[PDB]
From Swiss-Prot, chains A, B:
The gene is icd. The modification Phosphoserine is found at S111. It comes from the Bacteria. The record marks Y158, K228 as: Critical for catalysis. It comes from Escherichia coli (strain K12). The modification N6-succinyllysine is found at K98, K240. SUPFAM superfamilies: Isocitrate/Isopropylmalate dehydrogenase-like. Mg(2+) binds at D305. This is Isocitrate dehydrogenase [NADP]. Inhibition of this enzyme by phosphorylation regulates the branch point between the Krebs cycle and the glyoxylate bypass, which is an alternate route that accumulates carbon for biosynthesis when acetate is the sole carbon source for growth.
Amino acid sequence: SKVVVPAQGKKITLQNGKLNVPENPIIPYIEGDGIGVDVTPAMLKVVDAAVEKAYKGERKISWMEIYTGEKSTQVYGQDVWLPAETLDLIREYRVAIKGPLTTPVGGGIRSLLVALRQELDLYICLRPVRYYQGTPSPVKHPELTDMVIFRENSEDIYAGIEWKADSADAEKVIKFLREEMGVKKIRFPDHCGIGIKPCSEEGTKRLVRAAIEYAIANDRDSVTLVHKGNIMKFTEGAFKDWGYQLAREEFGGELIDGGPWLKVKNPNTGKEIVIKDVIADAFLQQILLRPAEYDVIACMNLNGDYISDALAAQVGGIGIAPGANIGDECALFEATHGTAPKYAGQDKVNPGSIILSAEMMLRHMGWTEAADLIVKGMEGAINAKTVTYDFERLMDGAKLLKCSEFGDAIIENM
Amino acid sequence: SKVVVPAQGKKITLQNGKLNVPENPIIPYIEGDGIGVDVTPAMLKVVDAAVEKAYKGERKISWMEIYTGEKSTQVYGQDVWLPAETLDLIREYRVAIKGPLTTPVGGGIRSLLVALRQELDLYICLRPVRYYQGTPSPVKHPELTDMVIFRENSEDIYAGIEWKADSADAEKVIKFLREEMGVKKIRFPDHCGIGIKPCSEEGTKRLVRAAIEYAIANDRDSVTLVHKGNIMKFTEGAFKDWGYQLAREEFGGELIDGGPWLKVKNPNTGKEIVIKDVIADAFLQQILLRPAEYDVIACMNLNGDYISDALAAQVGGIGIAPGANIGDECALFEATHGTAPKYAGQDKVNPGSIILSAEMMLRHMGWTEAADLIVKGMEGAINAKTVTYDFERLMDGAKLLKCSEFGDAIIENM
Ligand SMILES: [Mg+2]
Ligand SMILES: [Mg+2]
């Protein structure tokens, strides 16, 4: 209704599991709030340059702006933070990319990003974190990190099922728990907020299946289920068990020496994939002390939220970390950082997260060559120390570049 | 009934908030399972040596072994993992210390450590983490870390209120939620485990009050409330709000320039304490990238579990990290690592966590001089590179010591 669907350009098709991508696909993008105004222009410029370079003019993307967040209230009206047509358009055009979003406070509006993820049932939050040589890191050996985070995106405490303290509803569910379920474990039932953590068999098996398949297709060495299952037996503990059962039942997992770990043989390379588990607080130590031991990681919503941020900080990449939300019918690639409004319009922040989420987008489309030119671009620019302020602060001998100029620097190293 | 209460020795008294400690107090200790057999002897030896040195023979501790875990089934019988008299004795004798505990699987027995904490309402899990010069660390600047973790210990998802998937009870509470509470947010209601997260006003204000008081008494620079309140509004979001309200209402917190942060003036040094908050996944990046910005940390049960492990790993201290569980009527100091059964009896693991929890125990008793001789001992031994296998593996020029020998090394540097 306010989106101008491009004249030239053809929709991507989902031909039974397989993406049928035309030479001129229409890709929707959400600019995003704050620094979205800076980083999204830089990304459209390097993606265009990468598909121009690789397919020598044969392929072109028709970009189509759609709306969510604060820019949406300016286009559709003060009340509409998430237009229903954004939800239809992402689903229809199949892949889309977004910058950072602002969710308001004081209006009872829950995370606009969690709403997109859940409404479109984009159940896989895929977050690859690896070190780019030369970015400044807080740890001695960041090059030992090359992990891929499969974070469940549709259940856990993120479902948003909770009630306020002293509210009638909170009184009612605490009443049900104490009277009809006989729970005596609530220390203070008065002035008490209540939240519900769900975890289901379908929910975890579809995520773990996506993770083990990724391990076979890219012949990764292991899949690690992280959980706090010793304290949360029937949610986190059930996640670990249902994940081992899926490895046994669907991938022919066999005990590695008395268990509990399994071995899945990669049907293509013949190598064995180790299916293991590690408790979540111990895992937060292990990624710092022994990061070479881990590779593909499968976990629930909140733990993947913590794991992926903790892990992006140690390889010096809190500003260049990519992300994808993938479902069976569509995908939404995204900048994983915030809106940072103080810097908005200044052309100074790192466009690296949204650009690397764009390589993930192209790789998803099967435009592998274009996608490889962007990580070549990135490696080159960082290595040239021709970098943006957040990296330059920590480097000796670096040249300071604007957001846009670092866009040009990536194209220069392609 | 199987505990031999010491002939000489006098109980500590709680004379209205104040601990009245005799010159010969009876202190209960739980040896612990696995490597407890190694580390607890080393700790009794350096604590004895420290009180001998400081008070030149005037004060003495009468140690009294009590039982929990696997050693308890050997003393009281196969069925008793936690004897009720352990719970009475800790409460009566007021302070106690413990090594690592084994909780069994297959018997429906939940964490024996969480049972002690909750049964005795030891609502403060205090975890100080600071760098000891010379211990090997994975990060470039571990010396910038000197934080104190006030982790809430009586509520959150740790309360243990959950139901199995496909169980009658799980079906019943999912029925109540959908039918009587009208929740439509459960993606898969079939084959679904359910957990309950509670958070109350009394629960968080008593923890935050303990944290801000610690900041005044040791004139620390700030108190940081970490939470995932944007997604969990009525539990984690309520924790942040109730904590700021307690700073306003009880400590005279005033807005630092338009808010949201507050300033509390230390009534004793005149310095201002900054009361701030940071979202939990961003905090996991911030402790790695900017650890000098943070000091006393207040948080809920699961986030403090993750924060304290993540933080102990970066200063090279996963094996020398101390801990305390403090309530209004008693305290249980503890080794924060596991039982590590493969090494049990070999006299090879680090006795540093339980020894540093013993300095925390003495400091609690008011035996400050004894307590200061142990951290002097520790600093000396580590600096001398006269260390145990876990540190020696990562050091060049170190002398390898047994668990017991490192006990003697601490006494040697006192
Ligand atoms: Mg996050
Ligand atoms: Mg822990």
